[PDB]
Amino acid sequence: ESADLRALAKHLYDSYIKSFPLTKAKARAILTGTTDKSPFVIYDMNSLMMGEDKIKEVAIRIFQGCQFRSVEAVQEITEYAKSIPGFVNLDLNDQVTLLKYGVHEIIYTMLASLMNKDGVLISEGQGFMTREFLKSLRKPLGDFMEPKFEFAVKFNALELDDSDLAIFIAVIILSGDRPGLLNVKPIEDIQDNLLQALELQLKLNHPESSQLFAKLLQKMTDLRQIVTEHVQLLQVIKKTETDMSLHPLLQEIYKDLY
Amino acid sequence: SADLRALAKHLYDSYIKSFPLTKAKARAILTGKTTDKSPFVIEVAIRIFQGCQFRSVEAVQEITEYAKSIPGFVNLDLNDQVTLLKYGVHEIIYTMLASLMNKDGVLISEGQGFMTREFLKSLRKPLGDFMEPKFEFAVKFNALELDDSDLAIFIAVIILSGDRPGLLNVKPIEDIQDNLLQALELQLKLNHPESSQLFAKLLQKMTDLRQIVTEHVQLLQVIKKTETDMSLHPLLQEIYKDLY
Ligand SMILES: O=C(O)[C@H](Cc1ccccc1)Oc1ccc(-c2ccccc2)cc1
Ligand SMILES: O=C(O)[C@H](Cc1ccccc1)Oc1ccc(-c2ccccc2)cc1
């Protein structure tokens, strides 16, 4: 096929644009000092102090920032998922299972688009927080973002664009091996087609590269472990951080009471 | 008193620092006499509920800060601090939400808007049911006419509840709560002399709070198991429950 596979890729790209406000192209334009308002750079504490002026303690603020982001991201990703042909015809429980596992893997995928070697874009491109600043933080915070940077630098060296990413994300969501799925076949049928679309897309968009498709499938597997490592940093915090302002208490509430 | 009145003052001052919209502020807006920018009067199912989810994120931080200011609290075993806050948060969210409600609707976005009760009740099948029980609670709660000074102590008593499941050291929690209860009582006697039995009514309300929370959780569980549209599931809550 081409037509259909190409048509599918375009459909995914269009819905990705509708669902996700900050695209990689947008982020890359800003990270390329394309001067249409340079981002404010947060690079030491002196410069952190000023950052509450030209944007919308520091540990708390960074952590709450992440929690807010997850709220927004779930809605964006859910909308994207619903646009994947076949998805909303799956059993309700399986739709839940797929999104439940897919969400965080996609958050870290898309976070890479805002990162480079040196730091991460924040507040919708208004600011840039330095990697080494994040590293210098206090005990819980110092090693929180670093694994996401490690992931991102290697991920970004593959040079995917938004068109690639739209199909990548769709393949991840339609993963037939999530624990607890009830009907695997229809999920796999959809994913097989998405994988063919991805492959064709990569062949057309990436002449210079070898084995990009296979590399990308490796990355889908790596994401699983990025999720599990993040969850485990949080568990250490729950058991050892003396200051309740630094615990992810909302997460504990939903787990134990809801 | 010295201590009991001093404790009441300390709690009130920290409540003011920790919680931006006070009942007095809210009551002033809900007074169309006090015109200093009238509130704007109000898919939607999704938007309103994402709005609640955002609010919970913010509220946890405010309440945590308040809790830390209660003398004794930060010296408790860490597990117990977690347990107390974990159960306290939603009960306090609904307590404080009552301050923004009257029988006709609820103040939102820091007093910038007013959503009518009728509008909230009219929504689609899952959504219609969410806010109404909170309104029922609030109307009766607000007829007790507590002010912010009262509320500061009320909330502290709730947080220091010695019967939360999973507590390891009950005694030190009860010692602090016994004092908070005495402060509350004295406060109510001094601030609401005309209101015999207010203290007892307030303790009933603490228990009712636990019911409100449980009903809200249950509405959400029905949704998780029966709503065909994923946009209407509380997917974040499902993620933290199953994976985290
Ligand atoms: O687990 C999640 O949903 C997010 C995921 C995320 C991670 C990096 C950027 C954006 C989102 O990570 C969090 C990290 C820390 C916290 C948190 C919040 C308050 C206090 C302590 C930790 C919450 C979520
Ligand atoms: O349970 C919670 O943490 C909040 C509590 C709350 C209730 C009213 C005002 C502020 C907070 O209520 C929610 C209600 C619905 C939802 C939700 C979100 C997305 C899709 C479906 C339901 C999330 C939270």
From Swiss-Prot, chain A:
Q: Which UniProt keywords apply?
A: Activator, Biological rhythms, Cytoplasm, Diabetes mellitus, Disease variant, DNA-binding, Glycoprotein, Isopeptide bond, Metal-binding, Nucleus, Obesity, Phosphoprotein, Receptor, Transcription, Transcription regulation, Ubl conjugation, Zinc, Zinc-finger
Where is it expressed, tissue-wise? Highest expression in adipose tissue. Lower in skeletal muscle, spleen, heart and liver. Also detectable in placenta, lung and ovary.
Q: Where in the cell is it found?
A: Nucleus; Cytoplasm
Which GO MF terms are attached to this record? alpha-actinin binding; arachidonate binding; chromatin binding; DNA binding; DNA binding domain binding; DNA-binding transcription activator activity, RNA polymerase II-specific; DNA-binding transcription factor activity; DNA-binding transcription factor activity, RNA polymerase II-specific
Please list the residue ranges annotated as the NR LBD domain. 4-256
Respond yes or no to whether keyword Phosphoprotein is given for this record. yes
- BP GO terms, sorted: BMP signaling pathway; cell differentiation; cell fate commitment; cell maturation; cellular response to hypoxia; cellular response to insulin stimulus; cellular response to low-density lipoprotein particle stimulus; epithelial cell differentiation
Where is coiled-coil annotated? none
Its activity is regulated as follows: PDPK1 activates its transcriptional activity independently of its kinase activity.
Motif span (9aaTAD)? 248-256
Domain comment, as recorded: The 9aaTAD motif is a transactivation domain present in a large number of yeast and animal transcription factors.
Involvement in disease: Defects in PPARG can lead to type 2 insulin-resistant diabetes and hyptertension. PPARG mutations may be associated with colon cancer.
Q: What is this protein called?
A: Peroxisome proliferator-activated receptor gamma
Q: Which organism is it from?
A: Homo sapiens
Native organism taxonomy: Eukaryota, Metazoa, Chordata, Craniata, Vertebrata
